[model samples]
Target chain A: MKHSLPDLPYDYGALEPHINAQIMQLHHSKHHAAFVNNLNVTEEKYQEALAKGDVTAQIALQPALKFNGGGHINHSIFWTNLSPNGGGEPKGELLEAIKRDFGSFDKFKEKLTAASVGVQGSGWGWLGFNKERGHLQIAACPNQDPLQGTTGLIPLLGIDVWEHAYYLQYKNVRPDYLKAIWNVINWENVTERYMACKK
Target chain B: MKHSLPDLPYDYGALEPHINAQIMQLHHSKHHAAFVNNLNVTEEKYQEALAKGDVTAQIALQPALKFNGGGHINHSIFWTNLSPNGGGEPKGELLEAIKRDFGSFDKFKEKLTAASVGVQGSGWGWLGFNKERGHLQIAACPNQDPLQGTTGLIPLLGIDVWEHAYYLQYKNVRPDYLKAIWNVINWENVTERYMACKK
Candidate 1:
């Protein structure tokens, strides 16, 4: 099946001042929609190339697949990872795991925020479950690189640091956007993703 | 000596409607300035690490060094590549070389613009001279990776594709900026850069 833009779990206005309806509207409707379209087009070409065993064409297709594929995958999860009702912290087993891996929830927030803000250019900061390690890890990816493919991390949460992600509201102060994002983090969704990895 | 931001070859207003003073002001005074400041600081630490022969510290510094160093070098060339009075075409051997290598000046423009616009993320599109091949090459670099350092091609002209380069005035329409930039190309400066490669 062709990939589609997953419906945002909440309304555009749901995140309020933390994310602003304006940012969410353009992000999901315009940005992620383009990714889905491009990803589909890229995949069709890739299928054709593979059918012909056109290795050169397959190699040529990689950069586009990496960018559009990653964009589609990352933003799909990013939408589910935030909510109008989200904020505060995790609960139960996920909470215990975060504490054991990262000391405390606040420390986890600090490290994630630091990694998010420290991205030198367009990228994402991820909280991932290293399934092999059985621990949470903090990581960053440049551009739209999917965390799993590039870093071997099962992404539990992602904070986009691209200019379009916050420039309309936060300008160049990425730290402000990073700080604000936590206010709407859908920990329930993240906890579910982490729990699945525990198996 | 510490790396420093170079003064723009012309006034921020000189590029006018083609680029707008607002983008140039922020790009030079803020973005480029930060690159210079950080590059200086990174170099100092790198020097210390090198003196101590701490391989780990030196390796850790490579990413920062690449970003900051490439930024400083690229932007310094970018400002000079445009002029208030520039546009139309080049002169002498450079003009001849463009036609010889790329078919015609029109084709060269089309190719460079395509390369610049096709960049998937924060990056630069360059016209560079190959020291060994002795011909002009069109290239695109992700983030601030310098052309020379990464590709061994000596940079002659650069079109920055980072959102900051055109996002304010052009918004997300990068092609519009690339289209407008042709009106301000300082072929004199570009020719001088190309001529330098003759040695």
Candidate 2:
């Protein structure tokens, strides 16, 4: 089946005070919708190229495949990561793991924030679970590169630093936007994702 | 030493209607200049991180290094690959190899044009020399990824498909831009590059 845009778990306005309704609406409805559309179109073209064993055509289609595919994957996780009734911290095993790996919750926040803010252009900062080491790690990916696909890390949470993510509200100051996103982070959802990966 | 932008071989308006002066000036002085500036800054930071053995910082620096470094590498090749007195066809061995690898000169043009026009977003289409097979190959690279670094192909000719390369003149019609670029391709420069790689 062709890829389709996933519905947001909550209303666009639900993340209010922390993430404005306007940014959420446009990001979900327009930005993410474009990725889904482009990805489906690219996959269809890829199928034709693969059947003919046209190496040049196959090689040429890689960027579209990666960019659109990664864009879809990253944004799907992002919507669920925010909730009106979220934040305050992850609980149980996820909390213990975060503390164990990062030393403290505040330090983890600092590191993730730094990574997000330091992004030179459009990209994402991720708190990911490394299945191999069985530990939580922090990483940054440029453009729309998905965490797992590009870096071999299972994403637990993602902080989008793309200008469109907060440009309307935050303007050129990304640090302010990074600070605000913490208030809406869905720790419950993150803990559930973490639990699933541990298996 | 820091990388500096190279001067265009001919005046900014030399390519005339094929590629306008505005595009040339902005593409070289502004866009390519920014890449050189950013690459220098990123390399300086990378040097410090490597000395300190800061693995996270080093990992975080990868995107900037690739984006800026590739931007520099691709544009430097591009400037030399165009000329006021260019176009027509390759001579001698370069002409023989093009026919041998692609079946005919027209087929090579078709493939390169297809690759250049098919770029999904920002990228370059390359005609590169494959040392392993000792043949000519066409490939497309996304964003600013250098053809050689990403694919191990020694770039013989590159057609930059970034919007900045043609947007001001061609607007949203990328195929028109791709078609126009062929008229200015410096085949003699390509032949020289191919000869160097053969030895």
Candidate 3:
């Protein structure tokens, strides 16, 4: 009921050369805010629909609920996934897991970049933990589909590929954006997310 | 084997106030051009897949084929769907068909707008002719899926809801963009298309 935009850990331009000030501002202030705001209205209508037992209304609300709710959930996590002094390579247990599962950190990046670049339209690229397999996995969530619920993998890191995510800065060359994003990726934050979920 | 980006029928600034020049230059030069170039690449790989009889590769290429092909076809028609001196209402037989199928021009706008706005992700909203039914129909194709072959509806006019189509101008408020698009719609072009297909 009290959804809100979270504070950026650093300045909008902190990830400069990778993500610009204009892109970050619109990404958060405009895109993310719209999702949260729309989701509020979404659930309110959903609550009323359920109370009145209107299946049609409830069914109609699914798209907005999923789109807005996933937008909120994904962006909330994405904000924390970057750091002003992040990137290079993950270390410790996460590094070991990446090496073991995907051969090496570079290979992991290759797989992740492939997934991100392969997305035909609005979607995300994810480095996730497959609980059943107990290993690092790469996945793609098409069109604002969140990591866990849709793909059954806990998201460790995600790359937003929706044109809105990088079009202002990257234009149509998504591969360039994908390569640059590796620089600002918050490996430490991703590490903690990994270890906590790994155990 | 080869594809090329079609020239926009009007100046990039022709649809200004509704769609900015920046949006059009990027939309046509960048996004549309990207699709055409990639489809050229996709076509080459498609031939290779066919030569080797690689069903595995052929199946994989399906996504690229449709996505890029549809992007080119949809945007090619979309440029003509707008005009510097367009809008008001479609005339002659197209008007009569709009009235027959969707009640009124206002209602057609509402339905098409709803279809466009209702798109959860990258997609197109179309007014197409169903030759079998001998009537106009409204269809939505998600993520560059063209109206024909997939829907068996010959495209008359379409509205691209892809974020790249308007994100630079409209942000996340797709409904507002949908409302503004009608102001630039080329009803005369739509009338000609309707006449050609209504046979």
Candidate 4:
């Protein structure tokens, strides 16, 4: 089965003037496509090497497969969790849980924003439900690390901290991107993702 | 004392069409300038807070100062070390050392490229002279971490692996950026920087 690009809920320009259409098109169609394509190629090569019992080849392909595959999968989910018309308060259980765990909605934003913007390089800031800790936690991942694999958190919301996410609009000002992304957040989707993650 | 912007070793458009003039302008003028300004501000605030015995104020400013200050200092060195007319390779002791430590200049390139492209987030890949080990080492840092801070390596050359470094030109193809940057390396500057190291 091939991993295909997921359909974006809104038009490429929908998230404008915050996130420009040109950026999104190149981001999803070109960048994300490259990741998916490269991931497939890497996996195929790895499988072929495995069939031949070439441990060295398998080892060599590990990094590429991990990086590309993780990238595609993570971004696939990410596109769905954003909408142009989204944002303005999470409701129901998610809100109640946020208040319970983080003190208040504003505090949650403050914490998540700090974690996300403070990440040093190309990475992600995630708000995830940690089954082990039994609470919502904010975490950062370097590069394309999947939240599930790295932290065992059921990811509800993820903030892409890569410069491509905001360089055109915010330039070197990453804090601006962090602040603005809140306006397009799909809280309903996050609530559902969180609800489904429950044991 | 004001920290002045270092003049580029070459004109803004010198590295084009590899790196466009626009990127150079914004990168040096806006991004690097902000870091310098913020670092200065943070230092002032930190000192004032310390004098006033406001422990909380000092604590609050740590992340800002570190992120912005390190960025300023790091980028200052990074600029002169890239020249539009740059090419060829390292000289004298540095070349000999690179050959000895990494097996070959080619291998050093390979390792450094892997480390640079492998970086998951906005960070740096460095070819640093490790004082304690008395060897050259390649390392990566997430965000604005000075190479010396994250690894005990005195940076000889650094590759900015942030998306903003190459996203417009190379998009998700960071390997292209990694490969291209080699041509612009100011090896003479690097050699001088190495010689000046106390160790």
TM-score top scorer: 2
CA error at residue B58 for candidate 2, angstroms: 27
- Identify the leading candidate in terms of DockQ: 2
Query: In candidate 1, residue B155 scores what lDDT?
Result: 87
Per residue, candidate 4 scores C-alpha lDDT tens digits across B1-199 of 4455676667889988767788788888888988877866766675565445333343355457557756875787788778876767888988998899999999999999999888887888888887877778888888887776445577789888778778888999999887788898889889997887744
Residue pairs in clash, model 2: none
Tens digits of lDDT, candidate 1, A1-199: 4566788878889987888899999999999999889977876775575455333344455567678878887898899899887899889999998899889989999999989988898899999998777889999999988888677788899999999999999998888888888888999999989889876
| lDDT string, candidate 4, A1-199, tens digits | 4456777777999888777888788889887888888976875674465345333343345456557766786787788788887878898989989999999999999999999988998999899998887889888988987777656677899988888878978899998888888888888889889899775
Tens digit of lDDT per residue, candidate 3, span A3-106?
66778788989999899999999999999999888977876775565445333344355567667878887898898999889879988889999999999999
Clashing residue pairs, backbone N/CA/C < 3 A, model 4: A120-B143, A121-B121, A121-B122, A122-B121, A122-B122, A143-B120
Q: How far off is residue A179 in model 1, in Å?
A: 46
Q: Tens-digit lDDT track for model 2 on B6-66?
A: 8878899999989999999999999999988897787677557544533334445667777
> Where does model 1 exceed 4 Å of error?
A1-199
- TM-score of candidate 1 to 2 decimals: 0.53
| Model 3 ranges with Cα > 4 A deviation | B1-199
Please give fnat for model 2: 0.00
Give each candidate's interface RMSD in Å.
18.0, 14.7, 19.5, 22.7
> Once superposed on the true structure, which residue ranges of model 4 sit more than 4 Å away at CA?
B1-199
